[PDB]
Design a protein around this ligand. Structure first.
Ligand SMILES: Nc1nc2c(c(=O)[nH]1)N[C@H](CN(C=O)c1ccc(C(=O)N[C@@H](CCC(=O)O)C(=O)O)cc1)CN2
Length: 193
């Protein structure tokens, strides 16, 4: 390792993250749409970072980039795989936090690289807890990227257990979110048992 590389960032454009990665002398490209395994976007790519990427990455891409593709997920895996992890962490009163993991063929099931718990406070809202998770996982990424960049954390099998949600699962609970993002979380804790 140590050779200048090419990093593909999947998800929304984040100039701060592009700049951070380029300060290590790597070249960066960004993409937010679906990827066929033949896409030229993948040519000559050394490492993939997905952060808010909206699509399932095809298994042939996963295999081609074994141990070279990571995802930033704002849950404490194995809890709250999938959608709306912050909300579900309150509805199901689960552990809360953020996780950097290797991408495998399933959704948010790959090997864990590092995680961090994130606590909440009596008067937090979904907005304030979401923002804290976002800041925490961006911090955790930058804290550990100098090591990850050089293959120094091989990851561990994702513990068996936890939970998984699809985007539609929250519909029967939306009536609790009377103030949208500014709903106090206290109103939500345990409401899905
Ligand atoms: N193979 C793979 N692709 C990955 C991830 C992963 O761990 N493995 N992490 C991210 C997972 N992700 C976002 O970061 C993401 C994007 C879209 C959907 C999706 O398509 N959801 C629908 C149906 C899903 C299903 O049927 O299983 C839904 O919620 O209803 C799910 C998760 C991005 N792509």
């Amino acid at each position: 390792q140590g050779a200048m590389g090419k990093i593909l960032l999947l998800g929304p454009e984040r100039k701060w993250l592009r700049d951070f990665l380029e300060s290590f002398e790597d070249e960066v490209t960004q993409y937010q749409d679906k990827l066929d395994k033949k896409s030229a976007i993948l040519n000559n790519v050394d490492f993939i970072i997905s952060y808010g990427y909206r699509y399932i990455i095809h298994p042939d891409i996963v295999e081609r980039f074994k141990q070279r593709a990571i995802n930033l997920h704002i849950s404490y895996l194995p809890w709250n795989k999938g959608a709306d992890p912050n909300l579900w962490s309150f509805l199901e009163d689960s552990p809360k936090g953020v996780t950097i993991h290797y991408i495998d063929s399933g959704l948010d099931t790959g090997e864990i690289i590092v995680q961090r718990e994130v606590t909440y406070y009596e008067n937090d809202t979904l907005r304030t807890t979401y923002e804290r998770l976002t800041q925490t996982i961006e911090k955790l990424f930058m804290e550990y990227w100098p090591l990850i960049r050089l293959g120094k954390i091989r990851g561990i099998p994702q513990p068996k257990g936890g939970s998984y949600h699809k985007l539609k699962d929250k519909e029967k609970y939306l009536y609790l979110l009377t103030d949208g993002w500014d709903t106090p979380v206290q109103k939500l804790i345990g409401k899905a048992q």
